[PDB]
Write a protein that binds this DNA or RNA. Structure first.
Lengths: 106, 102, 105, 106, 99, 102, 105, 99
DNA sequence: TTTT
DNA sequence: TTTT
DNA sequence: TTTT
DNA sequence: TTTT
DNA sequence: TTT
DNA sequence: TTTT
């Protein structure tokens, strides 16, 4: 039984080849930049394209799966959760989607 | 153009960490900024910056208080800005399109 | 890695008290009838009824904590099982198999 | 100043599907010219396969039938709907479909 | 027990085109027909028949056939490209006579 | 001799008070929203209510008489014919030929 | 308003040719015998055919039209109302008084 | 599933007396009613309802009640003492609504 | 069968 | 949007 | 009935 | 940075 | 900061 | 008396 719902659903294209690093533990961490492309038509008739860039991160086996199958430009589906991680010269924060499910859409 | 070119969907259920803040633009449009905690159990919390425009923002600021359980559906949006050290810094919101008070 | 996406999200109210049955192997199975209420103006209130099934430990938590009228959140997958009637006419029923649940009262 | 309803949802009924069509879309028209497109969609997992009746109205259903074919990969967002009928034994019967509100050809 | 309402349509006219038959995922027949009723102008009705009735309709009726239907009025709604709520009314058939 | 049959029989309750108008000629047009309530019992013992909503229209003296003896909630009998009119959109409605207040 | 509802819907076949008469005032009165047929399968597997017979009468022009276009065996649609007319012998016959008629052959 | 005839009666009127309910030797209920329908003349219809439908008529309907019936026409015959075949037409109720 |  |  |  |  |  |  859950005590909250924190769910993100993305379909888009990667902007660069996935990056793989490992934690101090030896666990795989795959960082990916994803563009979601929305395009509507304004009251003047223009097609306005609007892109949003997301930082998607996949851990363990799923990240390994991401690093191998996905490439720059790949169309991909992600289900995940929002989290804001800190990092460092001083402290700065980033909001990223931690993937729970990935589907290669070619 | 009825086909979608992407999907950018957020779904949140949690509680407000403080009372909503409501402001108006010069033209009078309402903007309601809120901080939403989502809980997961390990006892861990996640904090989200949610923003609601228009009537949806007025209804939030009137019906919700600190601790209110609430459902949001929205989309992710990142804004950028430049600090005093001339670095480009980013900030991510959930822009709300739907709300249930629960 | 996923070979498809089959996701349902429901926020609604239980139509009746959940029923908890057990399979031959002892696995708990909780069947629930959930109403989702939508409102639009021309004030039109059109409910949709969903059969929601919860297996194992989660089924037991629904049977124990949920009651008729409970506001509840479900996340699940769409699936259509078959069953039988008076004769041997196979009958079909689409239902949401629950993967997460949050009591909202 | 004054409006007909509040802007708060009264419930959530949300379906998300990615799969492949089992057959070419079937497009028909009501007496009034309104298009109705019925499609059968397979979602696969591990091999297991669920079949969904998806229906799309208006220009969305015309778009479905002009772009999608048998085996096409497609994303749908819609709502769950059950409609009923009576068989010749006078037993009330149910059939559940997904009414599509968004479609992405993949 | 006792009925709590009455919703009844009686139609005699001629089909505008050949019936169309489809099946749901589970194997249920759904047959859609457009029926014309004539008066002393002409009214068109969308008629749907589920299950075996649908199958029998699709087997026995063709374009131009004179047919009798008994059914009930049903309206469905949907949202268009502009997010307006729209409505579509059909006669869900319960009896059928080929004439 | 009739060339076709196009008959609708309804017993229901109005969902709102009747709406009376007049043509240019002074001819009443009475538009009503009628709910026909069906109720069956399902396998699990729930008694299920399914409501259908109909647009009924009455002309002339019958329209005047509907606006006169019927309110929101009134249970009423209607006999009429199916019609689809334009306004470019379409609505299927029941043009009443008989009415009886119950 | 109507004050009452008295309505009969019939589809069936005439058992004989329509009989036409005129009243002292000159009004056409056409009398018809109509068979409605009903088939069902019983629990023993038999296909049970039954038949009800109705006295249908049309007045005025419709009676003359019935008398002209309908023969024995003709399949016809009738809309009308129930009436019980008395006649000395004192007897009563319940008949359907046609209001609408459609020739289905 | 295709009909071969239509025998449909629709009545709205007022009872003439209280419903008379009896039971067969097997315990089956049969309710016999006298229904008045008015045109402003008054027509009278023997309505008969079986099973629980007849019981619900007997429990809810009284001498002047306004009631709706759906049913089918049926004529029974008998032989008087002059050996004439006599006919009696009743409405067998299949649906009923208390108004 | 729910809820507001 | 009604009604039990 | 699709897909890998 | 992607992609139509 | 919520729960 | 009809009709399949």
């Amino acid at each position: 039984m859950a005590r909250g719902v924190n769910k993100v659903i993305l379909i888009g294209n990667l902007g660069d080849d996935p990056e793989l690093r490992y934690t101090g533990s030896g666990t795989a961490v795959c960082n990916m930049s994803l563009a979601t492309n929305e395009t509507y038509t304004d009251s003047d008739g223009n097609e306005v394209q609007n892109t949003e860039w997301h930082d998607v991160v996949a851990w363990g086996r799923l990240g390994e799966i991401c690093n191998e199958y996905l490439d720059k430009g790949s169309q991909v589906y992600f289900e995940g959760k929002l989290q804001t991680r800190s990092w460092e010269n001083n402290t700065r924060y980033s909001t990223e989607v931690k993937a729970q499910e990935m589907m290669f859409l070619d």
